[PDB]
Symmetry: C2
Subunit: 285 residues, 2 copies
């Protein structure tokens, strides 16, 4: 599906950015704004100017998700972005720090965007990961699709709004206007950076702030004698809802793509785990 990409940089790896552009263009995609690989106001305008980006059915790809989004949140024109996304929505995709903007979008107007690969980390990596490439196009091209993996957890079925992304970024939003108030959801979390104790401290905060227990289920993506198993065990000891581990999701070279704010059905059985996702915007045919 040959597509139009529009690069945004709300958050040094220019060679990998070019390698990503070259791969996309070589494969017959077009890049709307190649010129912007040559400050606050300029990073801010990358986002606010999306409300005036009216190219048809466009994939808006975050270039990198190192830090910077947090500075922007109070100056983003949320209403104009939410208005934009009411018709021929941009298909907005990124991860890591980009999670904060994604959550902001959800909180102001249930705008669905894709927690998934970025130009530098994924598309311009030394090897393009096929698993990641597959799941990206899988999500953007199919109005209903299913992710399968060998998850670890109780056998169960839950259905609700899919949300989450990067754990630290989601924590950074508690207390603020940009925390989405989603209940009875399937909450998917990743943070491949952090020390286990920090992961635990953050999961606990989600617990004691009342976010985790109000969901229908919790899925943990990529994270890497006190280790991560102790953290899962302790969290499970607090929760009366299923917590499933083992999804390839986050900043590993393997990551699925997840439409935050879409509808999902989680089904975990002895045979393995399925997540069926629908309602997100797709490439049009």
């Amino acid at each position: 599906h040959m597509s139009l990409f529009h690069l945004i940089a709300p958050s040094i790896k220019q060679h990998a950015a070019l390698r990503g552009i070259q791969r996309l263009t070589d494969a017959g995609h077009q890049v709307n704004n190649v010129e912007v690989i040559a400050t606050e106001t300029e990073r801010l305008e990358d986002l606010n100017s999306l409300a005036r980006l009216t190219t048809p059915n466009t994939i808006v790809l975050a270039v990198r998700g190192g830090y910077g989004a947090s500075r922007l949140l109070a100056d983003i024109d949320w209403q104009a972005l939410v208005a934009r996304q009411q018709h021929d929505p941009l298909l907005i995709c990124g991860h890591a720090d980009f999670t904060a903007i994604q959550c902001g979008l959800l909180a102001h107007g249930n705008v669905i965007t894709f927690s998934g690969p970025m130009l530098v980390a994924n598309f311009g990596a030394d090897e393009l990961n096929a698993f990641t490439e597959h799941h990206f196009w899988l999500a953007l091209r199919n109005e209903t699709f299913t992710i399968e993996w060998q998850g670890e957890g109780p056998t169960c079925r839950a259905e609700g709004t899919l949300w989450g992304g990067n754990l630290a970024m989601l924590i950074s939003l508690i207390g603020t206007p940009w925390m989405p108030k989603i209940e009875n959801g399937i909450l998917v979390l990743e943070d491949i950076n952090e020390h286990p104790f920090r992961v635990e401290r953050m999961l606990l905060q989600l617990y004691h702030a009342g976010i985790l227990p109000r969901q229908k289920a919790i899925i943990l993506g990529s994270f890497s004698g006190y280790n991560l198993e102790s953290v899962y065990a302790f969290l499970r000891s607090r929760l009366s809802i299923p917590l499933i581990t083992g999804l390839d999701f986050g900043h590993e070279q393997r990551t699925v793509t997840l439409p935050l704010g879409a509808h999902a059905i989680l089904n975990n059985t002895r045979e393995g785990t399925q997540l069926t996702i629908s309602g997100h915007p797709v490439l049009k045919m």
Copy 2:
């Protein structure tokens, strides 16, 4: 002066025995020397804390051993009311930092119970040398009903008074949205952190900003943590003074602050003073 220290280890060994040795050689005494044995379980780390409600020897200094991870696990099981009740008469003088901030905060949230953010057994008393600055500032706070810390702080020249609070930034962040967040406004909030990358410091400071915590204080002091863009950015969002350069936190130089005490911040051109009162002291 010569004191009784009672050790607690709700969080987290050579340096620990060296710290005990330094305290006992100076003529202090140390109870609960057995918390350096367990490697312990939730239940016992819990009991370190809950049993303080029945430690009634007066003028006792409860000293946290280390402030690595652990407290977060305990907060929902701590008998906060029994601790608040204990501290209304001949209160314990409870001192720690780092992870210990969370307990300190829970105490504030439950009863405006003052405690001290300052040295701990392993990091401070058991280091290669006992740092004289830190030593002086610990005893200054515990012995004097009114005392004044001075330093060459950087910020606007200003005078502000309110409830002093804060401690470790990440730990205070961990409490937003939970029952253990102190509800202090019009205060003097002092923050420090260790081994945080600048961008992580910024994210945390921004969260305190956007949750409405920073702008509701009278002032913000930054302790020990390149972060100049981080100070510049937060200053660009705040309408209240933000003073840097205090020696507070996890470096060998740290002051000791009585969280929940009354403070007057005075920053001038010739330097910064923080005048603190209302906290419990060693009584003679």
